[PDB]
Design a protein around this ligand. Structure first.
Ligand SMILES: CCCCCCCCCCCCCCCCCC(=O)OC[C@H](COP(=O)([O-])OCC(O)COP(=O)([O-])OC[C@@H](COC(=O)CCCCCCCCCCCCCCCCC)OC(=O)CCCCCCCCCCCCCCCCC)OC(=O)CCCCCCCCCCCCCCCCC
Ligand SMILES: CCCCCCCCCCCCCCCCCC(=O)OC[C@H](COP(=O)([O-])OCC(O)COP(=O)([O-])OC[C@@H](COC(=O)CCCCCCCCCCCCCCCCC)OC(=O)CCCCCCCCCCCCCCCCC)OC(=O)CCCCCCCCCCCCCCCCC
Ligand SMILES: CCCCCCCCCCCCCCCCCC(=O)OC[C@H](COP(=O)([O-])OCC[N+](C)(C)C)OC(=O)CCCCCCCCCCCCCCCCC
Ligand SMILES: CCCCCCCCCCCCCCCCCC(=O)OC[C@H](COP(=O)([O-])OCC[N+](C)(C)C)OC(=O)CCCCCCCCCCCCCCCCC
Ligand SMILES: CCCCCCCCCCCCCCCCCCCC(=O)O[C@H](COC(=O)CCCCCCCCCCCCCC)COP(=O)(O)OCCN
Ligand code: HEC
Ligand code: HEM
Ligand code: HEM
Ligand code: HEM
Ligand code: HEM
Ligand SMILES: CCCCCC[C@H]1C(=O)O[C@H](C)[C@H](NC(=O)c2cccc(NC=O)c2O)C(=O)O[C@@H](C)[C@@H]1OC(=O)CC(C)C
Ligand code: FES
Lengths: 111, 124, 383, 61, 54, 71, 85, 244, 110, 55, 55
């Protein structure tokens, strides 16, 4: 599941990623990525994808679970984000920004 | 810039035959296009005077030359505000465009530059 | 002795607006000074009036400007007058600076009025930028976001400074309230500097289009320049009228009539037209910090004109090569303006870089070369 | 060129009827028209501009 | 014509009074004149032209 | 019925005939290209937007004044 | 560098006689038709090159740049755009 | 950018109000309000316009009060502090179809219909853009355009895909004045209406500008005579120099 | 006399400035202060009531009054600073008086 | 000549705050002028700051 | 310690009729209560959220 938390007006996508989702994200060779990053750089905890859910192209909010890399699809110009929230296809230049988030408890994070 | 600089550089150019052959005709056309003669000015009337050196040089002008300069400036100011040009005898002919002020300012500056040099002398 | 000379207070007015001795041959380009004074007065009158109807809270700002347009008697006029006069202020200020560059008003003995002038020009930019934000439309927000994120390029402290100016982590209510206070204040500071540059000028008096002394032939400021200033006041008011009453939105950007939305980014963020040349200069440098420095340097480099102009003659009236160079400089400054509003696409990227190099090379290379050569041509040519 | 008692030629600009009241009156008609429009314009400007301070339409409602 | 000058122009107090009275008259008449002109060039367009239907 | 329909048709057959034919030929090419297999796995998919804009821009230039005259 | 009336800082003036007439004695618009036509023609002709040269050059530059830009973002210009990026 | 990405630029139509001396056609404004009320108001708000603004522009005071009195607005709480509704008054603003953005987007497949009070000033093109957009839905999108789901092709809208479907069809409105309600007629009327909504001072502003132009022109003419008059002693000055 | 006379105007501006600033809080003393003080203007014959409504921007002290007092309260201190500077410039001709009331021209200190 | 006297701008500051000739015997009641200047500065500083937070 | 006791009186007696509208839960933290105690007080109440996706 992916949650949408407003944080400074901007939406925050929080996905509770499954084991096989993590695996799917850890596949793509870093080499072939507009914005080259691995999931380990993005998440500080593999079960908590926390991103700023604003598309890096112009600034629409991607519809999650949709896409072609089954992560997030920006409907505006058709840019596809990953399960890491990395850009794969479409006009968007960068991967979906990661806020500064810390796990105060294992059951609560602050953003 | 200093008038001294302008004068020295000009003399270097006039010395070199090659340089003078190409520069002197240019400078003559430049002055024709400049069009200060069409307001009845002599070249030297255009030099910036709000400097201590230039004020001193103007004070050293012979009375006649000074009175004539004041007339040319007033006449030119009047043509400027009327948007007219000089006609007839008011136009400065090339032979009348004499460097009446250059000798005075070169003496003023010679002293001022000597003073600066000598302020920096070192007994060996 | 006449009261206007005897009484100390009256004497100060007298020395500036009545008995002030002026050259008798100032042309129409000497009238932009008084037009800039008129712009500054209109902006204070309309500005103070808008402040009586404006609410600086971000939940209400945009709505308060709609209230001004729709409900306040003549509010449309006061709003459009204020917005358009800001454009006219920059037309007049560019004209006035252009006049000063062409006629060598920056040379001794007028380096001080010129240098204070460069600061007036910076304050006007800051003032007009902050005023733009107060509407809190989309251009307001996205302008403040982008411009204040340039400050992030200041090393080490940049980020901290930005958050301090915004009063928070993004442009929001705190930013809007503080820009309102400062935008109210800055025009008063600008008026004080305008008055200082005049006091500084009073020692030498106005330059004139011939670049010679005017000490030989002076005319009282009144009535001659009083009545000459009225012609351009009425010419200005004709232009003002055409914009304010008949095309009030011609100089503006429609995006500012959409309320600020932090999510949606506008199609294109371009500044107000009068900032466009500096924006083009900034885009020309690929480095973020480099770009900011270049943009500020594009204004501060005017402070070196007194040094780099090596001419023994004041102004360009008599200098055909300098006039051509100045023509190219002014047209390049307009091309920079146009390049500030195109998209960052070929072939405008390289063109913008060439125009930026030309802009700086005027001050650093060409003006020193050309002014040196003209000195030599005047001397040889008149021998 | 030399005599200062030979006043330069001003005939291109001198009005023949220069000391008539008609002549002065005309120029004051121009000045006065200008004062009249400036007064009418200032009244209009002030009245329209200060009316912003009268109750706005929402208040009157 | 001397009479006109002497009465309305010679004293500045009279001249300024004449200018202000003229300004008053101009203001009033010009308002009325523009109103009529504006109504003729915008005929059948304004609310006053269609109000009669209601 | 809608005046615009007639005016647009008239302007397409008349002063904007070259642009009408351009758009038509474009459409023919694109439809034919879509008909062919392994079109979905192509790099570049041609549209007809450019030709459409040239046509519409032309039609509008020839119609604007005429249309507002009949309203 | 500038004084005030009475001591303006002029070099001493002597030998210049200045004459003028009253504004009420002059025709303010004397020879205005001649000036508006012939004088303005003269003054414009003399300054024309200093405006025409830079304006015509920068207009040509802009025209070429804007036409290239327009062409690059057409279908025909796809390939040249791809190389330019 | 591609012209697609910019949107086709709208034609310049000769609106009644174009022209320095031209007001809006108020009969068109009234017709345009009827289009807004019967078509646009389903999805779009007009939040900055009050019922009082229509009075003496499009409607008499009675007609506008009748429109206001048909609606219910939030009153101040009763004496037990329970919420209450009241009938609308002239000072009330025209109410929107949706309570908030979220409701608006849910009803419009994610797209948020903007408020139309300023739309004529908030888009390049103004009335021409609104007219062009409403009339500019082709029967078929140009071959090769891929529309996103819930998008409609419209060349005037930047990007081409707009979340608003074609809405004006011949006879969706029945005008009360017997004008044939063709798509083009309704778009012209509503575009005029929205232009008025965005700039309601337009008629007054241009009349005062006519007065300003005339007075300022006269003062400019006079100021030039006066300048020349006062400067004539300086322009006419002549010198005789006798070198001492 | 001139520095003194300008000073009397500075004193009036200070009163106006401080009165408007007091209103900006919009507490009870703010409101009731603006109500009673601006109703004194109602005593001006014939036009008094009209002037009050014009200053308030309405028929009572409310939002329009508050917004306009904010703008003016911001501005008035700058006007007051200018007059303060004018009374000093006026004083400069005679210089400061002194506690003995005699000339100080004989014995000056920087 | 000293810069503070030569330069027109500096000279105005000079004439008011530095070389201004004062009587030698002003008592403490002549200090309210500068306190009023200080009040005016504090009111501008605090006032402008409040305006950044006030609605 | 008196402040904390006073809060308990406010909460159990005055709050029945009187509001304390200008004080946020965060204001009690590090004055009368630890962050945990204050969050516990806040989390017991319901406040108006932004509308859901159906508005
Ligand atoms: C903005 C707000 C509105 C207020 C109006 C202020 C504008 C007035 C102003 O300063 O410009 C008028 C100004 C008239 O000023 P002026 O006092 O008659 O003469 C100033 C120059 O010395 C005039 O130079 P000149 O005597 O050498 O005459 C040159 C001028 C002819 O000047 C005119 O009289 C026109 O003609 C041109 O340079 C035209 C360019 C040729 C292109 C074709 O017109 C120009 O000078 C335009 C040329 C600028 C390039
Ligand atoms: C508020 C903001 C705070 C800032 C503080 C500034 C206040 C300073 C000031 O102007 O007053 C001090 C001032 C001391 O100033 P001072 O420059 O030594 O002499 C000024 C008098 O003209 C010299 O007056 P005098 O020489 O005739 O001395 C008279 C003074 C004795 O003065 C003394 O200081 C002792 O004693 C009295 O008048 C006290 C009255 C008897 C009450 C029992 O205090 C008074 O003399 C107050 C007398 C007022 C009644
Ligand atoms: C556009 C390019 C401008 C080039 C001007 C060249 C000179 C010319 O022909 O102008 C006519 C006149 C020539 O006047 P002039 O004073 O040189 O000559 C008068 C006639 N004589 C020689 C007989 C004394 O120039 C001006 O009046 C120039 C004023 C400059 C204003 C520029 C504003 C630009 C804003 C950019 C800001 C940074
Ligand atoms: C801004 C508002 C300006 C409105 C002007 C009001 C009328 C005064 C006027 O026209 O001035 C004419 C008058 C007279 O102009 P004048 O001073 O040239 O006329 C004097 C000579 N007689 C009396 C013989 C005509 O000017 C003034 O009195 C100065 C006030 C103008 C400010
Ligand atoms: C502050 C902003 C300055 C800009 C002023 C220009 C025009 C604004 C005037 C408002 C306006 O629309 O007035 C119109 C006439 O314009 C005019 O006639 C005004 C143009 C005249 C030029 C200005 C002359 C002086 C103005 C400045 C002085 C103000 C203070 C000094 C006392 C028509 O309005 P209306 O005729 O319906 O108005 C009712 C009286 N019948
Ligand atoms: C049932 C829905 C619906 C109706 C009916 C409707 N609209 Fe819209 N409109 C929308 C939606 C949704 C958008 C936003 C489209 C987008 O952002 O993709 C929109 C956008 C607009 C825009 C702005 C497009 C832009 O540039 O951002 C204008 C103008 C507009 N509508 C005017 C009208 C007018 C005029 C009418 C009818 C006379 C109308 N609409 C009828 C739903 C509607
Ligand atoms: C509010 C903005 C400004 C106002 C009101 C203003 C006003 C004036 C006035 C009234 C004059 C004398 C009359 C004239 O020559 O036009 C003047 C002269 C001057 N101004 Fe400005 N000015 C402003 C901005 C600037 C700026 C930005 C500069 C320089 C970058 C500048 C530099 C000068 C200089 C050098 C002079 C002397 C020119 C000369 O007479 O030769 N001023 N200004
Ligand atoms: C040099 C003087 C000034 C300049 C250049 C200037 C410029 C601007 C600009 C450009 C805007 C944006 C206008 C818009 O698009 O709506 C604006 C808005 C504003 N200005 Fe100024 N301004 C000046 C002086 C003042 C002053 C003195 C005040 C006094 C408070 C003021 C108050 C406002 C207010 C309240 C707004 C917001 C309302 C609005 O947008 O119209 N301004 N200003
Ligand atoms: C902002 C308010 C004011 C400021 C900042 C101010 C400042 C000053 C200063 C600095 C001086 C010279 C030093 C001194 O004698 O204390 C002075 C002198 C003076 N002030 Fe003020 N003043 C203000 C208000 C007033 C008022 C309200 C008046 C009169 C009602 C006034 C009348 C004078 C007079 C007459 C002098 C000359 C006194 C003398 O030296 O004998 N001032 N003021
Ligand atoms: C002579 C200068 C000034 C005086 C005598 C003055 C006086 C006052 C007074 C008496 C109040 C009521 C204070 C309260 O009880 O809370 C106040 C409030 C205010 N003043 Fe001023 N003021 C001055 C200058 C300024 C200036 C320059 C600003 C610039 C904006 C300003 C902004 C405010 C604001 C925003 C408030 C309301 C906030 C508040 O009440 O604290 N003041 N002022
Ligand atoms: C009332 C006395 C107070 C002194 C300052 C007031 C103003 C003042 O000095 O006015 C003058 C009329 C001045 N013009 C000139 O110098 C001038 C000189 C030569 C030729 C022309 N034009 C040619 O035909 C001129 O236009 C001007 O407009 O400068 C303002 C900016 C001043 O405002 C200020 O600095 C204070 C503040 C409002 C900016
Ligand atoms: S805005 Fe996200 S795809 Fe273009």
């Amino acid at each position: 599941k992916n949650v949408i938390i407003k944080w400074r007006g901007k939406p925050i996508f929080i996905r509770h990623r499954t084991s096989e989702e993590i695996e799917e994200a850890n596949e793509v060779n870093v080499a072939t990525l507009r914005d080259p990053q691995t999931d380990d750089e993005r998440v500080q905890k593999p079960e908590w994808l926390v991103m700023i859910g604003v598309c890096t192209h112009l600034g629409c909010v991607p519809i999650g679970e949709a896409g072609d890399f089954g992560g997030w699809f920006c409907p505006c110009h058709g840019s596809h984000y990953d399960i890491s929230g990395r850009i794969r296809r479409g006009p968007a230049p960068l991967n979906l920004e990661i806020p500064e988030y810390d796990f105060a408890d294992a059951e609560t994070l602050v953003i | 810039a200093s008038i001294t600089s302008v004068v020295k550089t000009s003399e270097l150019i006039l010395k070199s035959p090659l340089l003078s052959k190409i520069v002197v005709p240019l400078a003559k056309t430049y002055v024709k296009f400049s069009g200060y003669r069409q307001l009845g000015f002599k070249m030297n009337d255009l030099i910036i005077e709000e400097t201590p050196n230039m004020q001193l040089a103007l004070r050293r002008l012979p009375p006649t030359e000074s009175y004539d300069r004041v007339y040319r400036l007033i006449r030119a100011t009047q043509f400027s505000l009327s948007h007219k040009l000089a006609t007839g005898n008011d136009i400065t002919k090339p032979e009348e465009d004499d460097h009446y002020l250059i000798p005075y300012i070169l003496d003023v500056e010679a002293e001022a530059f000597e003073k600066d040099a000598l302020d920096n002398l070192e007994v060996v | 002795m006449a009261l206007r000379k005897k009484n100390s207070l009256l004497n100060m007015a007298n020395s500036y607006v009545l008995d002030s001795p002026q050259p008798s041959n100032l042309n129409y380009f000497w009238n932009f000074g008084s037009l800039l004074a008129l712009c500054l007065v209109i902006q204070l009158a309309t500005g103070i009036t808008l402040a009586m109807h404006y609410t600086s809270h971000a939940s209400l700002a945009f709505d308060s400007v709609e209230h001004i347009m729709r409900d306040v008697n003549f509010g449309w006029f006061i709003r459009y007058a204020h917005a358009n006069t800001a454009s006219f202020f920059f037309i007049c200020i560019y004209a006035h600076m252009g006049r000063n560059i062409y006629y060598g008003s920056y040379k001794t003995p007028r380096v001080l009025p010129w240098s204070i002038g460069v600061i007036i020009f910076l304050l006007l930019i800051i003032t007009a930028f902050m005023g733009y934000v107060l509407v809190f439309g989309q251009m307001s927000l996205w302008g403040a976001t982008v411009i204040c994120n340039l400050v992030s390029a200041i090393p080490w402290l940049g980020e901290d400074i930005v958050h301090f100016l915004w009063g928070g982590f993004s442009v929001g209510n705190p930013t809007l309230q503080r820009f309102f206070a400062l935008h109210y204040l800055m025009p008063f500071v600008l008026a004080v500097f305008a008055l200082l540059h005049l006091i500084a000028l009073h020692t030498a008096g106005s330059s004139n289009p011939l670049g010679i002394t005017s000490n030989v032939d002076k005319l009282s400021m009144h009535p001659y320049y009083s009545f000459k200033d009225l012609i351009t006041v009425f010419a200005f008011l004709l232009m003002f009228t055409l914009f304010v009453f008949f095309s009030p939105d011609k100089l503006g950007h429609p995006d500012n009539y959409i309320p600020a939305n932090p999510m949606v980014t506008p199609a294109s963020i371009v500044p107000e037209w009068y900032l466009l040349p500096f924006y083009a200069i900034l885009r020309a440098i690929p480095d973020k910090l480099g770009g900011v420095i270049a943009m500020v340097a594009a204004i501060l480099i005017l402070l070196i004109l007194p040094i780099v102009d090596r001419s023994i003659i004041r102004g360009n009236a008599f200098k055909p090569i300098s006039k051509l160079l100045f023509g190219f400089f002014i047209c390049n400054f307009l091309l920079l303006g146009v390049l500030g509003q195109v998209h960052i696409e070929p072939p405008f990227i390289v063109l913008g870089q060439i125009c930026t190099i030309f802009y700086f090379s005027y001050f650093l290379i060409l003006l020193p070369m050309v002014s040196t050569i003209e000195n030599i041509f005047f001397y040889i040519g008149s021998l | 060129g030399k005599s200062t008692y030979k006043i330069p030629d001003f005939t291109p600009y001198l009005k023949k009827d220069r000391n008539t009241d008609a002549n002065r009156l005309f120029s004051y008609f121009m000045i006065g028209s200008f004062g009249m429009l400036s007064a009418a314009g200032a009244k209009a400007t002030v009245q329209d501009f200060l009316s912003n301070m009268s109750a706005s339409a929402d208040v009157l409602a | 014509a001397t009479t006109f000058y002497n009465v309305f122009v010679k004293r500045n107090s009279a001249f300024v009074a004449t200018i202000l009275a003229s300004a008053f008259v101009f203001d009033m008449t010009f308002e009325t004149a523009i109103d009529n002109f504006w109504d003729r060039i915008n005929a059948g367009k304004q609310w006053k032209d269609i109000r009669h239907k209601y | 019925p809608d005046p615009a329909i007639a005016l647009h048709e008239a302007a397409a057959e008349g002063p904007c005939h070259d642009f009408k034919h351009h758009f038509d030929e474009c459409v023919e090419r694109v439809t034919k290209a879509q008909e062919a297999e392994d079109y979905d796995h192509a790099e570049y998919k041609e549209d007809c937007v450019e030709e459409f804009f040239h046509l519409q821009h032309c039609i509008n230039d020839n119609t604007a004044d005429k249309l507002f005259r009949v309203l | 560098y500038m004084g005030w009336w009475g001591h303006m800082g002029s070099p001493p003036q002597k030998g210049i006689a200045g004459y003028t007439i009253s504004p009420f004695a002059a025709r303010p618009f004397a020879g205005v038709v001649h000036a508006a036509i012939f004088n303005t023609f003269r003054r414009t002709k003399n300054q024309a090159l200093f405006v025409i040269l830079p304006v015509s050059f920068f207009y040509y530059v802009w025209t070429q740049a804007s036409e290239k830009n327009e062409w690059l973002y057409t279908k025909a210009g796809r390939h040249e755009l791809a190389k330019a990026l | 950018m591609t012209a697609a990405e910019h949107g086709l630029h709208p034609a310049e139509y000769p609106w009644p109000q174009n022209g320095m001396l031209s007001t809006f056609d108020h009969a068109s404004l009234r017709r345009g309000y009827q289009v807004y009320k019967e078509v646009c108001a389903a999805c779009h708000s007009l939040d900055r316009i009050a019922w009082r603004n229509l009075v003496g522009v499009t409607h008499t005071t009675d007609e506008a009060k009748a429109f206001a009195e048909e609606l219910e607005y939030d009153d101040e709480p009763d004496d037990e502090g329970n919420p209450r509704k009241r009938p609308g008054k002239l000072a009330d603003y025209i109410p929107g179809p949706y309570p908030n953005e979220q409701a608006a987007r849910a009803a419009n497949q994610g797209a948020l219909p903007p408020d139309l009070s300023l739309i004529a000033k908030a888009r390049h093109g103004g009335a021409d853009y609104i007219f062009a957009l409403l009339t500019g839905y082709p029967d078929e999108p140009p071959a090769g355009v891929v529309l996103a789901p819930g998008m409609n092709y419209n060349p005037y809208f930047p990007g081409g895909g707009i979340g608003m479907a074609r809405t004006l069809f011949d006879g969706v409105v029945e005008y009360e004045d017997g004008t044939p309600a063709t798509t083009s007629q309704m778009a012209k009327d509503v575009a005029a209406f929205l232009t008025w909504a965005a700039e309601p001072e337009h008629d007054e502003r241009k009349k005062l500008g006519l007065k300003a132009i005339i007075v300022i022109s006269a003062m400019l003419g006079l100021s030039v005579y006066i300048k020349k008059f006062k400067w004539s002693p300086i322009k006419n000055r002549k010198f005789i120099y006798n070198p001492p």
